Amino acid sequence: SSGKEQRLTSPGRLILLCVGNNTDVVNVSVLCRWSVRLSVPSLENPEETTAPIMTQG
Amino acid sequence: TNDVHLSGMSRISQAVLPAGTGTDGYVVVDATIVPDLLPRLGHAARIFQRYAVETLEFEIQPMCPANTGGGYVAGFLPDPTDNDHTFDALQATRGAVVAKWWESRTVRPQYTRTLLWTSSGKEQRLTSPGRLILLCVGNNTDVVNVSVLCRWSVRLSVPSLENPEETTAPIMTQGSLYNDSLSTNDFKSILLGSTPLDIAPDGAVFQLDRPLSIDYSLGTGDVDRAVYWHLKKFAGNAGTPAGWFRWGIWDNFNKTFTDGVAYYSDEQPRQILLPVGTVCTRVDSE
Amino acid sequence: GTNDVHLSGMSRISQAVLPAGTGTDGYVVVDATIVPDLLPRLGHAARIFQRYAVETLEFEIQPMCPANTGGGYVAGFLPDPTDNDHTFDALQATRGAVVAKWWESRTVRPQYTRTLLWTSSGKEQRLTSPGRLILLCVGNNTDVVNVSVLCRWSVRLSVPSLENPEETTAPIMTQGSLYNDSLSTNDFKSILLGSTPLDIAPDGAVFQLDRPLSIDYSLGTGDVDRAVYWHLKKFAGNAGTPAGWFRWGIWDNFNKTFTDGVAYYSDEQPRQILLPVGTVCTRVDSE
Amino acid sequence: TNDVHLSGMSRISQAVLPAGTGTDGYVVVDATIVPDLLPRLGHAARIFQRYAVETLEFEIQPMCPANTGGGYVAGFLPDPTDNDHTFDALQATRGAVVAKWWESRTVRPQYTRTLLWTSSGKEQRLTSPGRLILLCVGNNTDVVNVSVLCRWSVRLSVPSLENPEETTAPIMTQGSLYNDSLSTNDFKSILLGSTPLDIAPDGAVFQLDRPLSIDYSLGTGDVDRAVYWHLKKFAGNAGTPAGWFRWGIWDNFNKTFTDGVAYYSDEQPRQILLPVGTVCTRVDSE
Amino acid sequence: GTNDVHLSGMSRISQAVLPAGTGTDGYVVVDATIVPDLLPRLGHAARIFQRYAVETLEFEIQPMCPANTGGGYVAGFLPDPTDNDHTFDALQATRGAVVAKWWESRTVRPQYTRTLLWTSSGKEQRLTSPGRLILLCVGNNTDVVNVSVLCRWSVRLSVPSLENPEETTAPIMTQGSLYNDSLSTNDFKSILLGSTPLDIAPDGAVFQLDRPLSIDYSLGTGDVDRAVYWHLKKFAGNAGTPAGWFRWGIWDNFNKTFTDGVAYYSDEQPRQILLPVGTVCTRVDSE
Amino acid sequence: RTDAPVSKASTVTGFGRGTNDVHLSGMSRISQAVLPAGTGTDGYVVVDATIVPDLLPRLGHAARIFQRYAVETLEFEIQPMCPANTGGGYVAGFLPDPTDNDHTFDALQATRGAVVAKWWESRTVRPQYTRTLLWTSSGKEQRLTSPGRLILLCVGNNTDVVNVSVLCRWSVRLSVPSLENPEETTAPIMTQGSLYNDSLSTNDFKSILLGSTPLDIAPDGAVFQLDRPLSIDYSLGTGDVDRAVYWHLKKFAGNAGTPAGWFRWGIWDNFNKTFTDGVAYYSDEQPRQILLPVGTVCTRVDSE
Ligand SMILES: [Ca+2]
Ligand SMILES: [Ca+2]
Ligand SMILES: [Ca+2]
Numbered sequence A: 001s002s003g004k005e006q007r008l009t010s011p012g013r014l015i016l017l018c019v020g021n022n023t024d025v026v027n028v029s030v031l032c033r034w035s036v037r038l039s040v041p042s043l044e045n046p047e048e049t050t051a052p053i054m055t056q057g
Numbered sequence B, D: 001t002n003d004v005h006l007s008g009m010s011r012i013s014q015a016v017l018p019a020g021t022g023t024d025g026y027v028v029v030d031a032t033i034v035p036d037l038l039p040r041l042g043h044a045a046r047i048f049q050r051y052a053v054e055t056l057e058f059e060i061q062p063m064c065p066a067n068t069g070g071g072y073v074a075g076f077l078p079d080p081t082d083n084d085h086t087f088d089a090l091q092a093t094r095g096a097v098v099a100k101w102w103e104s105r106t107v108r109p110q111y112t113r114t115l116l117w118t119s120s121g122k123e124q125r126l127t128s129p130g131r132l133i134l135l136c137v138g139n140n141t142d143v144v145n146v147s148v149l150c151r152w153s154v155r156l157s158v159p160s161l162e163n164p165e166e167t168t169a170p171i172m173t174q175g176s177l178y179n180d181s182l183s184t185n186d187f188k189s190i191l192l193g194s195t196p197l198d199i200a201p202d203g204a205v206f207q208l209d210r211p212l213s214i215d216y217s218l219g220t221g222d223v224d225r226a227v228y229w230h231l232k233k234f235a236g237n238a239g240t241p242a243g244w245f246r247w248g249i250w251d252n253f254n255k256t257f258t259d260g261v262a263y264y265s266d267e268q269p270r271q272i273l274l275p276v277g278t279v280c281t282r283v284d285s286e
Numbered sequence C, E: 001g002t003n004d005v006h007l008s009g010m011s012r013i014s015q016a017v018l019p020a021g022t023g024t025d026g027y028v029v030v031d032a033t034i035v036p037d038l039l040p041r042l043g044h045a046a047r048i049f050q051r052y053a054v055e056t057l058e059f060e061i062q063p064m065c066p067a068n069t070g071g072g073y074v075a076g077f078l079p080d081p082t083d084n085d086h087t088f089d090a091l092q093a094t095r096g097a098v099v100a101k102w103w104e105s106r107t108v109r110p111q112y113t114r115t116l117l118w119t120s121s122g123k124e125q126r127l128t129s130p131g132r133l134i135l136l137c138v139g140n141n142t143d144v145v146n147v148s149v150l151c152r153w154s155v156r157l158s159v160p161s162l163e164n165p166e167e168t169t170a171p172i173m174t175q176g177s178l179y180n181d182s183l184s185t186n187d188f189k190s191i192l193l194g195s196t197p198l199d200i201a202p203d204g205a206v207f208q209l210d211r212p213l214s215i216d217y218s219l220g221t222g223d224v225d226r227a228v229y230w231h232l233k234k235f236a237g238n239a240g241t242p243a244g245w246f247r248w249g250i251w252d253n254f255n256k257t258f259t260d261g262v263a264y265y266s267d268e269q270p271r272q273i274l275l276p277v278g279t280v281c282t283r284v285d286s287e
Numbered sequence F: 001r002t003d004a005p006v007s008k009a010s011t012v013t014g015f016g017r018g019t020n021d022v023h024l025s026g027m028s029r030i031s032q033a034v035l036p037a038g039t040g041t042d043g044y045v046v047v048d049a050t051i052v053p054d055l056l057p058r059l060g061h062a063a064r065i066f067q068r069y070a071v072e073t074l075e076f077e078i079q080p081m082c083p084a085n086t087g088g089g090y091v092a093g094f095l096p097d098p099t100d101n102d103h104t105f106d107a108l109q110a111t112r113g114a115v116v117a118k119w120w121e122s123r124t125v126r127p128q129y130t131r132t133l134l135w136t137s138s139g140k141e142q143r144l145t146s147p148g149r150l151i152l153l154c155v156g157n158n159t160d161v162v163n164v165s166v167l168c169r170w171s172v173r174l175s176v177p178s179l180e181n182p183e184e185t186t187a188p189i190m191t192q193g194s195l196y197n198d199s200l201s202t203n204d205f206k207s208i209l210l211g212s213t214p215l216d217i218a219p220d221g222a223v224f225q226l227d228r229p230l231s232i233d234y235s236l237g238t239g240d241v242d243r244a245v246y247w248h249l250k251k252f253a254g255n256a257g258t259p260a261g262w263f264r265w266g267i268w269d270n271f272n273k274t275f276t277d278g279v280a281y282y283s284d285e286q287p288r289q290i291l292l293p294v295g296t297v298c299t300r301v302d303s304e
């Protein structure tokens, strides 16, 4: 369930930046291979499970 | 060591649900667990900043005649953030129990068991191990006077002196307040969808984390806008059991409430004033 | 030495000057909320890693004044950073708390819970800060006291990162209710909020709010409109009012500059609270 | 102990050498190794006075299409004093590498491994273990955007607070400035023969360790002499890629530049103004 | 006992007197760059050997003043002799650094890297000096403070030599830019450079420069010539200007005497810097 | 059977793997003097040689391939040639600081190894030296490129001509592989004499005036460069006093009448390896000026 502090619901974020100027079209895809263990039994409505987003403008 | 262990058994809360009121789903206690709510621990917590839960059990204790023939479900939800009182949510928890109104039962929850703070803060996952909800499962035939007891043991860690108006649990709205639901000076508590607010005594004062905007007029056909951050509970009675809230100004030094400006509705567009998830701390002394 | 380092140092936390006779029982002389940035050598290290955990804290008071001054103070470390109760009894409750004469240095040696913290500030503050050192008077000071507070610290920095110099300063909770009675058309007094971090903030400073500042205005025509501002800017106080004043408006962010954008209307309105106790004022300006 | 070990990987520098520019010899990065240049270490060094190098490797990382068909040579010269960017000088060092522009390579230098200072000083053999130079070996067909990465570990020794304008590496001139090469108000950066100066951003201010003498006139046919110690870089563009320098006065308190007097040439004898080996520290904040 | 000796002693580094009310936050009261000669018993030993390495350093502050004085100071040992940043925060960063009231003696106990040094001074100064002790104010001093700074040292002298008494004194880096606006025809103010070693240097003193002092002049005829001087001489300051003044010219070296050789022209010229920040002024006079 | 790529990969294999160390040794004459009878008054500093690979010829060349060197053994021999009836005395010793400029009998005897003897006897000076690793390329600090200097002073007055020769027997280990141009491998030299603009000629000046034992016995056509600028007072030709700034000198050989020689200022154009001469000094009623102060560092820049 999402909360007020994000440091508690996400382990961090994956960012990818350009390093030069591409001469051509670039088709990048970024795959995450995960394994995780779910600990506590409960029923959480899908409205609260979403991640919060901060504007930067 | 500097740490202090403390254990006791204490009434978390007591509801009376009268004859015939109440129907499957009807939330009859919704209590966010924090030391203030646990009587003897209440005072111990006022001394340190940090507590950690060592043991927690709730013993349900309902009082009615043997022929009462209703029912309840109880349980403990570990997420003080999770705001979902449905039976399905409860039945999903560990500890959860069901019984007839005349039967006591003991819920044995699973809880955080880690180091928490005594005084309230932004993220309330650090102030509480969870919350206990008890609901109706049928229609109660008779008056039941349910008293839920909690046997608890805790570890208190760093010494401190704590402001008692800070120790209280923040209450969250469950329902939106629309501008078209305001009376001239007040509105019905039930709109906010919150049992703890609905049962907060007469004269409780609450500060909001979101502004309450009140459109008013000088009486010239001219609409103006005011802002308020405080509400006062005006007690509920048989006709309006949830009671009412007046907006206004809380003076924190003098500890006094002043009612705010009258609402004037004049062909305004539909608006959301207090969205669901508005937070409401008790700021008045107890 | 890839991920963990121990650093120790000591560093000035804050300096205050009490004019003669200023201050009284309970006058708050310094409320310093702790964060790696505020302590100088450390702040550089906390920019390298994004996690830190405190291992020793100690504060030395070192107030300087003549031997005759004869007022008093009390200092302590208050481990909740959330805790805004600045009463004497609540300060003396803190472990290590010391009370002495203005011409006596002392050393407060507290206990803290030694959790892992974050360097970059986020929403919940008990995850970015071990607490806040408070110092307050206990009598009238007879002479000018130029008090410096030092902090001896050792700390363990943990996760390699490179932070941006903007996110590191910790926000400020307002302590007092700002009524609209107290407004002036261009600006308002700092002391009204009652937060000593705001009261001391240097001029040309800009603070973003978490709640909206609602400004009344009119171009003319005897007509009252209503406007909204999320920012504040500090304009330095003068001997008459040391508090300083706050001017609202617009902090263009791409710009790197403030625009006052303040219009007010003083009229017969019903008394209102624009920015209530608990309003969170983050420092947004250039650094 | 009081000593602090620190390790990381960090971009030492990044050049773009565009299409067709650049020819065997063309120095594309010349970076004097000091902690300021290494980003994360940059901040750690601002705290102590002394650092010592434990490990150093540079990983070259060029970015271009596979068909680029130029080439480079890289290496690490251990003498921060030695001022010789030729291929032959590089090929003599240990670690040195050569490759096509599309290939990354890792230079493994040998370095002092002894105790050095964080802040700059007269003898720069105590501030730096050496310098890495990367040159062209052919003519590059395409745009290459080379990003040279350095994996480093160091030991930092005595705590201190360091003025950041002092931490920077002094740049040395490679070519003499002659009086007859001055324009009325400026001169071309390329004359000084220094890549780090040539690529220093617009508005960089530098102090010289040698006086810049400017002959001027009042406009009476009377030649007079002025002295200046500061230069301001005015950015280079496609027409003049090295850019230009104006002499003048740097005000250290206000952190401002004032342009100096115009140069007047009037049948003067040949003169050397700024001999090769003139030292040029960055004084302006970054 | 042919080559190595241990010596320990303690010795006065410097004395300063602050007139009443002189000094303010950050006023630099004493900047003493350490060298065997400055410490008296040692200086005699360092004449015998040509290599020395420091094993313990400790400074005791001992300022003398009335109990009421009530300003403050901060003192520390700054191990780079090259470091010219004299800010408070930069001094408090130094290990062992102490802050106290003007009527409190203190002891600064630092860490130093304990390298082998040279006794005879040469170009790079981090090979002749372990660093420099700095002391500066932290408030306005109410009374006259007559501060003495002591230094307790133990050191290891290593290579047998016999030095000449002229090479042993360490040179001085100028801190401030000397504009030609500030010139007077016969002399200039010492405070403009901002180097406390220069500001304090006793009169009749002679200092050679590493950069050229460019003096404008004219015999007459409304004609501006240009001249060059490498030297300076100190002429004592007076209560009105404590800084003192510097008079350029010629230090005949066979002579053992100064010759002013100063000519100036004050005219409409474009503002210039004759001696910029970092100018090295070596003490050349007789000893 | 491999496919055709867009680009093959580099195959530049053995690169950056050059020979690393070399021990190397020999014995080299480090100076020679001849003193006619009257000269050689007590204390006359007959010799003063700052030790640097370049002074030891064979070594000097090897040193242009490595960046460091460290001394493994040194001794000096003294070996004056003169007959038994010469009644003068000398004193030699190696000063382990290359910067130390005070040459007194007292300051030598103080040095470990130092020797004292009448002119007709040979002597070996077994000195004390750093045995750490210095640099081959010259630098700003001398303490880092030289282990010290060997000085030899007269002790009485020679009755007769003295033919002293001073040989240095060395062994050294060269540490770091690199390529160092012969311009930077030269040793810097400090003047010990002020140059006044009253003591001048239109285009040159005396070398004894600078008061430096090296610059005195420096060779012909030898272009130098300075750290400090030189101020030359020239003219437009209207009785006008203008100012000129030159950085470079040129050595011209000396005489039996003028032991040391001349020094013509000018311009060392390094791009093209040539030397222009400096403008006609304007003699004038100009205030007395020290053009180059005591301690001016002069570093040789022309091709060696
Ligand atoms: Ca949940
Ligand atoms: Ca608390
Ligand atoms: Ca972070």
Ligand SMILES: [Ca+2]
Residues within 6 Å of the ligand: D048, D049, D117, D118, D119, D160, D162, E080, E083
């Ligand atoms: Ca330093």
Ligand SMILES: [Ca+2]
Residues within 6 Å of the ligand: E050, E051, E118, E119, E120, E161, E163, F097, F100
């Ligand atoms: Ca010496």
Ligand SMILES: [Ca+2]
Residues within 6 Å of the ligand: D079, D082, F066, F067, F135, F136, F137, F178, F180
């Ligand atoms: Ca070299």
